[PDB]
Structures are given as structure tokens and as C-alpha cells.
Amino acid sequence: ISNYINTIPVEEQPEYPGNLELERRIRSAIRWNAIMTVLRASKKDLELGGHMASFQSSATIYDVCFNHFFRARNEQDGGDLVYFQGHISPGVYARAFLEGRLTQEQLDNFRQEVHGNGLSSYPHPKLMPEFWQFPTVSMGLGPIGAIYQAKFLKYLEHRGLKDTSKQTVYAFLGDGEMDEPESKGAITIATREKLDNLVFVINCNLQRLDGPVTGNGKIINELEGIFEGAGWNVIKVMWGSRWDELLRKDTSGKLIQLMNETVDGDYQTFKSKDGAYVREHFFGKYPETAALVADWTDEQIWALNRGGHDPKKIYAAFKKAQETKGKATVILAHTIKGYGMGDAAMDGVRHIRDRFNVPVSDADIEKLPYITFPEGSEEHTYLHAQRQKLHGYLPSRQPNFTEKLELPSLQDFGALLEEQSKEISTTIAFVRALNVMLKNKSIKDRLVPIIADEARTFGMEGLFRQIGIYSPEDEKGQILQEGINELGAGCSWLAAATSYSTNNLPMIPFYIYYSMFGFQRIGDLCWAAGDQQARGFLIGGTSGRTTLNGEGLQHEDGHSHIQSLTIPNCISYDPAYAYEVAVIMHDGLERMYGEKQENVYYYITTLNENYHMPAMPEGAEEGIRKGIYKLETIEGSKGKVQLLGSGSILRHVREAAEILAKDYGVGSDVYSVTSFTELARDGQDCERWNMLHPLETPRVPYIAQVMNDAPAVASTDYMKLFAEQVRTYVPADDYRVLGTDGFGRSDSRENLRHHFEVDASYVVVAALGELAKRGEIDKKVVADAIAKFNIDADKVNPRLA
Amino acid sequence: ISNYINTIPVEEQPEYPGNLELERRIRSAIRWNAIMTVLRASKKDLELGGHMASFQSSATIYDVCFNHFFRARNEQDGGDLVYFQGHISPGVYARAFLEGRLTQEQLDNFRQEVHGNGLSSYPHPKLMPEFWQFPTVSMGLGPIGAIYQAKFLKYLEHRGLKDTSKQTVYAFLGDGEMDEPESKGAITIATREKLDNLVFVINCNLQRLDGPVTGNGKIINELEGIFEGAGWNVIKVMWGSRWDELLRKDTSGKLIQLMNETVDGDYQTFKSKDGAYVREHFFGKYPETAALVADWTDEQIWALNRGGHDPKKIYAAFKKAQETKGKATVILAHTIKGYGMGDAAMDGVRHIRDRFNVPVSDADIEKLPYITFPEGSEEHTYLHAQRQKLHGYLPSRQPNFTEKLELPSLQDFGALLEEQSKEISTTIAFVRALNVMLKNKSIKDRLVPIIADEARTFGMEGLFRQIGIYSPEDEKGQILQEGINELGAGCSWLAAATSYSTNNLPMIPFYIYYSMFGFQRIGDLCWAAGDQQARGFLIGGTSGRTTLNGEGLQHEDGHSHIQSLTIPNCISYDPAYAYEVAVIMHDGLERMYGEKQENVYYYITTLNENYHMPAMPEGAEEGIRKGIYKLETIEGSKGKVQLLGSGSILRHVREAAEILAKDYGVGSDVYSVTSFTELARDGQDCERWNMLHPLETPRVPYIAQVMNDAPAVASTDYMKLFAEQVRTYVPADDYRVLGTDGFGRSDSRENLRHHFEVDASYVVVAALGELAKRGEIDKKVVADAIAKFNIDADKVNPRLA
Ligand SMILES: Cc1ncc(C[n+]2csc(CCOP(=O)(O)OP(=O)(O)O)c2C)c(N)n1
Ligand SMILES: Cc1ncc(C[n+]2csc(CCOP(=O)(O)OP(=O)(O)O)c2C)c(N)n1
Ligand SMILES: [Mg+2]
Ligand SMILES: [Mg+2]
């Protein structure tokens, strides 16, 4: 930790290149319109919300960036990637409005978006696909997402895919937000990777929402201490220009001492007092410091400002950041929260108009008018000139990539469609499918395989020899090895999955990890990825409750699909078979990166269990994509049922079908369900359409088109709700679902499948139970099956075990 | 960063208090039994799994701790709280066996739990309630959990609730695991809170699973740099005692330079070679370093070891940490991964028996026999003597607390059971309920209100004046204000929620935060809390997709209940009314902290929307607890439907009920569903039991004892699955569910409820639709209703919007 003063002394401060007074006129209009936007929303009394205090404290920081640093998307690269702090969005809207990119009508619909001509509260690409780029409102996610975006830009350069050298990634953070573990938890990575294209800009107004970040301490010193410790270049923007004469005049060093010893809480109290209270409780702490302002009027003292409000000090910091190589830079900008808002942070509005010399007359003020700069005006000319020199306007977003990729055909995955000689797993199928893609000339170098330390567990090690590990194992390595860091891997996957938009360079990430540590562990990033329109694959390896058998409670995933079905634009599959994996991956590839350019990402759970992989039935492709297809029909004269299974448990349903027929003369239709979720969604879509078109012929869910009315039983390696979600659409009156509800534990697969009551013996007993409720067989036969299979009818419910 | 040598020079090292030769014998027997345990499991060929290399690298560190530092649970306090590294559990089991706490049959059932008297793969209290305490295998979670556990212990002391001053929290971490953002993301908190009762022990073997943490860097220096910068006391245990002579006679300072400049990758290469290789490639880098070992044999050079394997260096580090105050200490223990296994770091294990001089012939070795120390042997006596001096054995766990609390009765919440005077929200109801608890002499000081920065948003500010904010706003403050850090807040909640077991001191936490940032953001910790048998309350505030209307996409929660239903021992509720909040909170209190001592925690979503709160219907209490009860029946002669709602949408369902009756002559039963999830679980339980007992009187799902067979419609502020989950158990053939599937966006509550198709209008159309399909009313009536209500039947499905 250094003294509590600017890192860049005035003697090393470059001349400011802009027109300060003109820039302030423009900035005042931006401040005014931002406030107007929020107040007009408030007018409506619809509890719309919206903030003002934060943008007021960071406005000047952003203003210097828009006038002298931020590069917009251009023909060479995507421009600077700015992770705008979420709640200062009203300031971004105000500026875009002044630049003529948004209309008054849109500002007037700030926070009312359902009817189409509105503005989102925060940066949501999914809601404003041509405007926002990075969802930052969910705090903590901005900072780590930025780190990995910066890393991904270096990767694209190193791999010879795109020259991103002129791009800077800016993460605009709040100081309270730095308490999120995700905010500082990955900062050493920027040093390991020498991310000199990354700048963290922390607005140190010393406050969170409901109080100071650390009133009894010095949050700026805390941040400096740990970032410096992590190898970052730290630039503190502490004081404005008026302090420069005062500091060089302090030959005693007591002013510095005074500044260093004062704590956050006290600096914040001074901010509320007055110029007299200041010379008294601050400058008046020591005679030498009190003597420095002895010849100062109380008004001249109150004029002393924080560095984050002085364009000259701000500019020096971003310039130094821009010049720095070898490591990332973090700028700690000292500001006043609710700057110039006196009242809280009609008289209040008048105070603001006056404080910032806003060009709004007394006759118009009550109309809360927006201010505009006419073409020909000095303000209009300068606003646009500065931006034209930096390549246009931002933020802006391109929702589709321009190039046409020549994707592999399903035929290209032919070997995976045939019966397998060796027993393999769906994870081995996934790796083989990836190898098929790495043979495609068009996309082979666009693929981005990602792992979180573990590769061998997923049989990814063979790929290493072929494409190597990215390690600026060299700078040309293709695989991203992110270590024991699922959030980080997820952020790399997200940067890759959105490169198609950000850099007009489609990249296709496959991130494979232990499924339990996916949505459960990085779920907020997964939701953010949907907002960001990510197009990529999440492969949840070692999936299924009973299948990663020895690992136990915190590893056995019988519910990731329940978490994944909550994401609207995540498409989820739980395939059993080698060929389904191939069809599913080919289709996802086509949908996301073919002409359709569908904005969805995929989640495929894969397995670590080897078994016989049969050939794909002729014509089953569409059913596989839609979610279900009839695999086999077994003959039986005594009764008929339908049996459904997915992932590793389909095996055992299929065994149950043999037993039902051989031992009980009960025929069955047997379905592989590659996606209960896609089927449930299709069902809801049909039910919804039907309800809204009462005069039309009811539409039929795909699952109801595949199935008949015979009593049905489903079993999967996931909790019962996974299969129960399609109940409403299943055309049979009786539908019984078995599942792995309950905490996992270590044992053999056989023991866990019996414990969770999903194995063949339970499927059989479940099927006979339905046939008994129909009278087709005597209840006694079900009782006898239970004893026959050594099923303990009285063991505790697995959910409670 | 300091030089790459021990922090503690030999000169300041205390004399080792133990019997080194006897300790080594005992330690070798533990290493052996640990290996035997895993190899026997392997032989079964059931893919059980299990690690050996990591415990070998950390065995000596744990050994010094077990013999000289770890305090077991005792009469005065819970002893030291040791977060053992997940996957060195075989070593803990081996020591426990040697201590006579586990039988051979248990070791022989390592990773086969299902039949009882087995052992979990990792620390899972839910599975071994009297043994393990803290679930750590989900790497990342142990370090942050440990930080907040240490802070919680300080809180307990500061609040005068329990003298925890003699307890130390030890977090045993891997160096690769430190990459998880959660591992270092909160390390600054330990400094803010002066956690001198916290010791992080990082096993620096330089390796994660598939390779080095940073082969081209120095992971120990990275860790030292950031922890030092975060204000921690860092103690490096780099080199064993054989190096002391070398460092002492090297007046050139070259050995140190050489140690400093060598990177992790090269150090790992040395360990894979031999003495000659080290002499040439390490010491041979400089004439002076070559000179230091010129008269050493290659064997003597090869004997040089890493500090983490020398009991004397280990002891000095732990003793120093024990005397360090004002901040937490992190010990960076340098070790060799695959220690003593060398060749592969039945007989290929005789290398291990010879390496550690294990008393087993080259003929019994194939039988993988366990070593024990008979009562009376020098080893047995010493093993137990050292532990007795430390109060017994650990880990161990007490499942229930001993004291009896005198809990508030439901009548104590009587004011909340009456009609409220003004329109309030369920969040206001929650705060009023907490206030009733704060008046109970028995539990008032055991309550732990927890917030993540925002308090005003949840109306928690009034409490600040009453019970204060914990700030060691002073150290007697009761509310934990964790800032913008949901994971940290969750970790404080977890420490509080398990204090009943850990410290035999029941504390009752209530963590309120924005519901979107609950399971979605800290879901892996919520799963771990379940494993840890947490008993507390998670209050998801500002919940419901349409209800936190202006906030938009990353805030509007219409799915946390889908995430929460995945945790077996989380009981979830979405009440509509203040009296339901009261009944649920009272019941939860009695279940978890009353004589039942049920191992479940609660999740209650609450709202930020005010509306009329009617009085509780007489006798509705149990129905509120169970999940559903009938509110009223409205007459109508043209048809009959059932209408269900929960949370903020119930009042709109009631509006629909009035519209149906008054405009269409359609009567209704109206139900408030307080918990769709508990009803679904009850139904699954009933059906499971019935089908396993085909001849017995079947169990009737609770929901089926409340609802009848008239067509039903449900609507809630959550995606359709939340209400669909009970379909199988609803006793009506038509059950239509409305929900908030799709990404949220900013608008008025009215606009969002119409966009998400969940408002009164849609419920009416849904109900009329069912009647028309029964030919009870003309299909035209539905079409006209759609028109009358300005419903756009062709707008896109909200799930895709
Ligand atoms: C994960 C998450 N938790 C909580 C919030 C709610 N929130 C909105 S503004 C705010 C305070 C932000 O303080 P700080 O980061 O210091 O920024 P400032 O407004 O001072 O610039 C919080 C906690 C959020 N957006 N995301
Ligand atoms: C969140 C999470 N991700 C992945 C794993 C899988 N895993 C088991 S051991 C291991 C490597 C651990 O390396 P390190 O932390 O360095 O410990 P060591 O065994 O070297 O002492 C990993 C990643 C896990 N347990 N938890
Ligand atoms: Mg702040
Ligand atoms: Mg390691």
C-alpha cells in the first residue's frame, strides 16, 4: 500500500487533450437527461424503479472514456468491450439519446418494455439485441466475465484467428460489488496470463447500497493491497487538481499523514458537513495542515474535490493503463456518491438545473424536458467528432455473424450412427463427435474444447496430441485448461459462445466438467449466458445419480436437468446411446451456427459408464431431436404397457421390458426419451396455443403423437420430476415415474439403482402395479413380483434416506 | 513476496515436543491402512474409486496436528473445527480405525454405504452424522465456509453467548483448489474481522489433478503475494531440515537465488528423476551452488526433502500461527504429491511398505492386511495419550443439541393471524414475525438475522435500532450485515444454522436477500448445507417473476422454487398472506428447534408488493403447513371449476373467481396453495408406498383430500412446472396450469402479469376453456372472453420472448 494520494503526480500527468468547458456542457446535458428519464418513470407511480446516485458519481469517469478512449465496433475488430456497471444504464441511455441513437419515445418508456418501444432497466442483450452486450447487473459476474473475455481476446490473437490487439476490455465495478467472491477470486489469472488488455475501473465512492463498504477501514487501501498483491498495476485517482498546490506546499508531510490515517467513515461524514466543519475536523487535526488552509476561505476548502471527478486526473489514469504492458491495470477512482444532488443525494430538480448549469428555463423545468443539441451547435459537433475519431458509437451489438460456415453433415458422423463393436459411453461418443468436427475444414479451428483441470476423467487426453493445450502446450494450443475453476471455465465458454456477436467471429465452445458443478455451482452465470445469447455446448459429464456411483453425495447428479430446464434458451438432452449424441450435436451445431443462427445453447449430460451401443434405427433422427422415439415393440399376450427411459437408465427399462414379456407375457412399446424437457416445452406450447384458440382443432404435443394409451412407466437417473414434467401431455391415463430423488451416497451402480428404486426390478413392479389397477392382473402377482425381486417394500423413501 | 525458503529459521524454531520415531511408526501404519482401504475397494472392480496420492503428500501435516494441535469436542466447547480436505478421507478413516473408532468391516466397506456400516467417499454429515462435520469435497466451499465459521465463533463470543476463544478453525486446502473463485474471493474478510482463530493450511504440492497448478510460475509465491496483500500472516514451510546446513554455509546467497528463480515445472521434473539429475540441473546451475553439495553423494542429495514432510518445520509453523493475533494465518506447506509411491506416485505396493518400513512380509502383502496396535503397545499408548491431552477424538459430530428451548406458541403470533389494518406485503409479515420471536426470552438472542447489504429494500431497517448491527453497530450487535456477498451471507447462515451441532448451541438464522441470488447463485452451498444438516430459514425476498416488476431479466425470479425442490431436506413455501407466513415460520421453528429436532431447513419466498391481508380462516393452520387449504366456495349455476394460486398471484386468481361467478355464472372452489412442492412430495410418497403395498389400504395424497373433481386451473408467479408438479395427484381430469416461463423484463406489474399470461383475465379464459371442452358452455364464450379481455392469442409464447 502506498500513500493515500494520486499514483500519478501532476509532474507526470499528460496535458488533457479535450475542451474541458465544452465537455462539461455535454456531460451536464447527459446528467440531466439521465435524471429526467428516471424521474419521468417515477411520475407514473408504477413502481418502475431506477437509480440516479451512482451514475452521478461516475459520470465524469465514463465521459472521459467516451471522449478519449472507448473504441467502437469497426471493420477490424469488435472495439473495446465495455462491461458498463448495470445501474448506471440511465446515463448510457441519456448519452445515446443525445447522440441521436435513441428517441424521446424510448426514454419515456424506460423500464416499460413489454409493448416494444422501451428500454431495459439494465444491460440485457436478450431484450435489446442491437444495443447492450454484457449483462453486469448481477454483481460479481461482470468482473470475472471480463477477465476471461480479455483472456479469450488474447487466445484469438495467439491462435491466429483474429487480430484483437487494439481491443481493451473495461470492467466498470462498484466498490461494494468487490465483496462478491467472484469479483476478486480470479484476479491472479490476469497476472498469470499477462492480460494487459484488461482494465478494472472501480468506482470508489466508499459506499454500498445501505452504508459504507468498510466505514472503520479504508476500502481503497484494501483493494490496492490485494490487487498489488495479485500482481496488478494499481492506479489510484484520489484527488482533484485543487489539491496539487496544497500537497507540494506541505513540506511537513502531515497532510499525507492526515490523509492516510483518516478512515472511510470520517471522509464520508465530511462529505455531509461544510467547509467550516472541514477545516475544523480534518485540516484542524494538526497545526501544519491547519496552516496550509489558514489562508483559504471556507468556500475554497469546500471546493476541494475527489480525483474521480477531475477529467485531468481520470485521463492520466486511463492513458497510463493504455500504455502498460505485462499485466492488468485496476484504476481505483475516488468519487462522491450522489454527487451534486444535495437534497436527497420540484426544488430538488431546480437545484440540479442550477448546480450543473443545465440549459432548461424556468418556464420549461416543470415539464421535466429532455435536452438535445441541434446539428450545427458546438456541443453536437464535438460530441460526434470525438466519437467518429474512435470509430463510432457504443454500446451497440450485432446479433448475427456474417460469414457462412460449411458445417459437417450428419453423414459425417456416420460411424457414430452404427452399432459399436466395443462397449463405450456417451462421453466417449461426445469426444468422437468432437473429433469429427476437428476434421471439418470450415470449423476445426473455431472449436473451443474447455476443461476444468480434469481431462482424463472425460477421456479428453487424446485430443491434446492433436490440437494441444493453450499455454502462452503453447500459444497455439487449442484447448482451454482452466484448472479447478468452474466459474472461470464457464466465463471462457461464454466469451467463446458469444464471439460470433462480439467479434463477428463464430467460435464453438464445448465445456465438459462434472455435471454436479454446472448449473448448481455456476447457475447465475448460466442465466447471464442466456441473457448474453450464448451459442455453445455445456456437456455435463459423469452425470446421473446412480452412475457416478462411488463419489457420493456432493457428486451424484440427479437434478442438473431440473436446474437447466429453468433457462428458457438452454436446450437440454439426456441421451442413452452413441448415435443420439451424434444426432443431437449435429443438430445443435446446425441450429446455432448454420443459417438459422438460433439463439440457444445446449446442455447435454453424458456418462462415464460403458455398455453396448446399438445402431440408430432408420428414420429416428427427427424423433431424437424432438425428444422421444419408439425404440422397440415387444410382443405379449397378457397385457401391454409403454416403457420410457433416458441416459444410463434406459438400459434397465429395456431389461424390464424383456422380463415383463418373458416372465409375465406383458408386451410393451419401449421409448428412448432423449429430452423430457424439450417434450414438456413442446407440450406447454401446444396447450397454450389450444387455450388461446378455443375455436380451432386442438394441436397435439409431439410426445402424444409418438405414444399410445397403454399404461406407462418411466425411469431415469434423475429425480421423478424430470419425467413427471410431461404427465399432462402423455396420452395414457396411468403414467408412473421412477426417479432418483434423495441425496446420493457411495456404492456400486447396482446397489444405488436398487436403493433409488429405478432399476429393472422396480420398473417391472411399477408396470405390473398399473396393470393391476386396471384389473388385467391380480394384485397378488404384483405382491409376488415384489418378493421375487427381493424388494424391501418398507425401506425408507430414498428422498428421506 | 519473501525468499523461497522457510519463514521460520532454525534459530527460532521451538524444540519438537513429540517422540519422532514413535510418531513415524504410527504414521506409517496409518499410511498403510489408508492404502489397504482403497486397494481393497479397487479389487472389488465395482468402479468404487478413491484417491491415495494426496493423503500421502499431506499425511505428516495432519499427523503433527493430530498429535499436538487439534482439540476434540469437549465439555466447554466444540473443539477445533477442522475442514479436512475432501479426498484425503481414507487417511482419516485409517487413523480412526487405529484409534478403535471404526471396525475392519467398516474399512472393508469404504465407498459402499447403502447397506449400513459402510464409509462415505468424502466428509458427508448427512451420511455419517456422528462422524463428519463439514462437507469440503466441492472444492472452493471449504475455504469460504471456514472464514465465516471463524467469524461466527467470534460473534458468539462477542455476543456473550458462548466463550469460543479456545477454538481454532482449520481449513485444509489444496493448491489447485485455490483457483476456485470462492477460495480467495473472501480472504479479505478475515483481515477486516481480525480472525486470529482461523488458519488456512494449503498443501502446496504444486499440482492439481492433471498437471501443475502453474508450471511456468511459482504457485507458492502467487499465494503468498495475494494473501500478504490481503493482510494475512503467511508462513512458508518450504524445506526440510537437511537443507539447513546448505543454506547456512552458503554465504554467496546463490542457493537462495536459484530457489527463487526455479519455476514449479522444473521442481516437479526433479522429483521424477534422481540425485545425479538434481546435482547437474539444479545445484549445477551455479559454481557456488555446485560447491555446496560437491562432497555429498547423489543419495544424500536425493534425500533432500520438502518442508511439509518434516515434523519439526510443520510444528514450528502451527505453533507460530497459534500465537499470531489480529489477523488470520495461512500456512503454505510445500509437499510431494505421490510421496513414497515414487514409481506410480498385490506387491507393487511392497515399495510403499519398504519406503515407510511397514511390518508386513512379501507374502501377506498380497492379502492387503490391516495393521493395528494392541492395547499395551508403545504405539497404542502414545496414540491415545496425545489425543487425550487434546480432549479426545476428531472428527466426531453430535446430531442433536441438548438444551430445551421454550419456543413461542402460534398464539404468540396472534396479531399476524388477524386481518391487517393496512395493506402490507409478505415481507413485512416476515419482519413482524421475526419481531414476535425477538420478544421470546428463550430464543431472542439466538436469532441471527442476516442481510447482504440491502436492508431497506426488505424493511429490515427498523430492526437495526432494536438489536443492532454486528460490528466488533458494535460487537454486541445482533444482525449480520455481510455486504454485497451472497455466498458469504450464506456461509454465515450455514455456520449459524449448524451451531446446534457444532457448539451444542442452537442458533436460528434468517437470511433475507433477493430471491434470484439464492439457489441460482449459491446453489452448491445450499446443497452442502443440506449435507451439513443445516437448520435455519432462507427468505427469498422480492420474489416472483412479475412482482419485482421494474428490475427485469436478471432479477425477476420465477424459478427459485424449481431449484429449491431439488434439495431433499429444504422445505419450500410460497405464501400469499401474512397469516400463512406466521403459521409457516412458527411450524419451522418447532420442527427444527423444538423437541422434534428435524433435520430440514426452510425456504420461504416473500414479496415486495402490498395488498389486503385477510384474517386466517378458523382451523386452517394444518392445511397451511401441509401445503393447501380451501379459502372459499363461490356459487354459480352455469358451471363449476377449482382455482388454485400461490404467492402474489393468488389474489388475481380470486379476482378471476369473482369474474367467473358474476359474468359467467360459473362457481368455484378457491384454494391457496402454500407449497406445491410439499404437496408433490407427499403425493410421490403416497404413490410409492401404495404400489409397494398393493394389497393394503392405499394412502391418499393430501392434495386429493382437499380438492375435488371439477376442472381446475392454477396460476402462480413461477414457471408452469411449479404448479404442474402435483398433476399426477390432482383428483380432476382437467388441470390447466399458467406460469411465468420465459425471461423477465421491465414493466408495470399489470403489464408483466398480462405478458406472462398469469393474470385474472387468463385464469378466466383458462377456466372457460375447460368448461367449453366439456360442452358445458359454448366454445364461443371462450372466444368472446379472449376478445373482451384484450388477450392477444397470437403473441409469441413468453418462454421464447
Ligand atoms: C448479486 C447482486 N446482489 C445484490 C444486488 C443489489 N444491488 C443493486 S445496487 C447495489 C449496491 C451497489 O454498490 P456498489 O457496488 O458499491 O456500487 P455504487 O452504486 O456505489 O457505484 C446492490 C447490492 C445486485 N445487483 N446483484
Ligand atoms: C468443485 C470441484 N471441481 C472438481 C473436483 C474434482 N477434483 C478432485 S481432486 C482434484 C484436484 C485437486 O487438486 P488440489 O486442490 O491441488 O489438491 P491435491 O490433491 O493436490 O492436494 C479435483 C479438481 C472437485 N472435487 N470439486
Ligand atoms: Mg460504491
Ligand atoms: Mg495440489
Curated annotation (Swiss-Prot), chains A, B:
Residue numbers bearing the N6-acetyllysine modification: K630
rRNA processing recorded as keyword: no
GO MF terms, alphabetically ordered: identical protein binding; magnesium ion binding; molecular adaptor activity; protein homodimerization activity; pyruvate dehydrogenase (acetyl-transferring) activity; pyruvate dehydrogenase activity; small molecule binding; thiamine pyrophosphate binding
UniProt GO BP: pyruvate catabolic process
Keywords on record: Acetylation, Magnesium, Metal-binding, Oxidoreductase, Pyruvate, Thiamine pyrophosphate
E.C. no: 1.2.4.1
Pfam families in UniProt: PDH_E1_M (PF17831), Transketolase_C_1 (PF22613), Transketolase_N (PF00456)
Catalytic activities: N(6)-[(R)-lipoyl]-L-lysyl-[protein] + pyruvate + H(+) = N(6)-[(R)-S(8)-acetyldihydrolipoyl]-L-lysyl-[protein] + CO2
Keyword Metal-binding annotated: yes
Residues binding Mg(2+): D175, N205, Q207
A GO cellular-component term linked to this record: pyruvate dehydrogenase complex
Assembly information from the UniProt record: Homodimer. Part of the PDH complex, consisting of multiple copies of pyruvate dehydrogenase (E1), dihydrolipoamide acetyltransferase (E2) and lipoamide dehydrogenase (E3). In pull-down experiments interacts with CedA.
Known role: Component of the pyruvate dehydrogenase (PDH) complex, that catalyzes the overall conversion of pyruvate to acetyl-CoA and CO(2).
Name of the molecule in the record: Pyruvate dehydrogenase E1 component
Organism: Escherichia coli (strain K12)
Name of the gene encoding the protein in the UniProt record: aceE
